[PDB]
């Protein structure tokens with residue numbers, strides 16, 4: 240369902256990382272498989288060649304936490320007007336306090352030790368169920 | 381520009397915002413609406429320094445890039461009982477426990 | 485402006501805007517103008533209040549969003565509070 244269209248109509252894009260994370264761009268290919276692309280360090284930008292109707296999303300390269308692009312989940316390159324490129328502004332969302340606490344706890348505890356934490360079983364499951372692109376593709380569908 | 385503050389006395393802490401161009405006296409009127417004590421019974425402080433009514437929050441060092449939503453700046457508060465003012469007293473927050481072993 | 489009082493387990497009294505406190509469905513239910521939290525100490529509840537301010541300020545905004553900071557030493561307790569408060 241969620242997949243790029245094979246249009247063959249060029250479209251130039253600036254990927255602008257306005258987050259403090261290392262960014263992984265992900266292109267959804269013509270069969271809907273996620274394909275990873277080279278990462279962007281915090282604060283940096285790249286001019287890249289893509290196509291009209293192609294689908295992209297963006298993640299933290301180390302943890303796969305979700306990021307936003309022009310204030311939403313997916314980015315689709317559009318028609319360039321007057322030769323000017325389209326801007327893809329990549330930012331942190333406002334995470335819930337719970338999801339942010341889970342991020343910080345995950346960054347300090349090795350997965351094998353989640354069960355030794357003194358918390359309710361449901362929070363152990365919440366930690367183990369870490370961010371993942373396939374999970375979100377199933378959701379977005 | 382908005383500045384984000386914690387106004388603190390003893391075991392009381394008020395979260396609020398104000399303009400950088402607003403005055404110390406105007407901040408006392410805010411405290412008055414919440415805690416029901418008039419400006420003349422209030423002293424405001426930055427650390428140990430007593431703040432003058434006519435000065436702006438900006439002049440006194442509360443600026444939009446240091447008094448942030450996720451990390452607000454502290455303003456101390458003392459009340460007058462009867463004739464004289466109490467000393468500035470701010471109770472510290474509780475201490476976190478040791479990091480569990482699996483977090484080291 | 486309508487304020488509410490949130491009281492920590494060690495007796496610290498946090499006075500915040502009602503609208504900010506309604507970020508939490510749990511707090512809304514406990515109100516519907518003071519709430520006592522027997523399991524949440526002040527070093528955690530103060531951070532909770534700072535999250536409310538952060539969320540209200542940066543939700544539906546254009547200006548770039550900074551990271552919400554959480555010290556390692558309070559992360560486990562803050563997680564438990566956020567789960568109880570559904571925020």
Ligand SMILES: CC(=O)NC1(C(=O)N[C@H](C(=O)N2C[C@H](O)C[C@H]2C(=O)NCc2ccc(-c3scnc3C)cc2)C(C)(C)C)CC1
Pocket residue numbers: 245246247248254264266276277278279285287288289290293
């Ligand atoms: C030959 C062909 O199939 N051309 C078309 C096409 O769709 N090509 C794809 C293509 O070129 N793509 C798909 C995406 O739209 C992006 C584009 C591409 O791969 N561009 C090169 C590129 C290289 C690095 C980067 C990045 S991302 C972060 N840093 C860099 C340097 C971005 C784009 C691909 C099937 C060859 C993968 C049909 C028009």
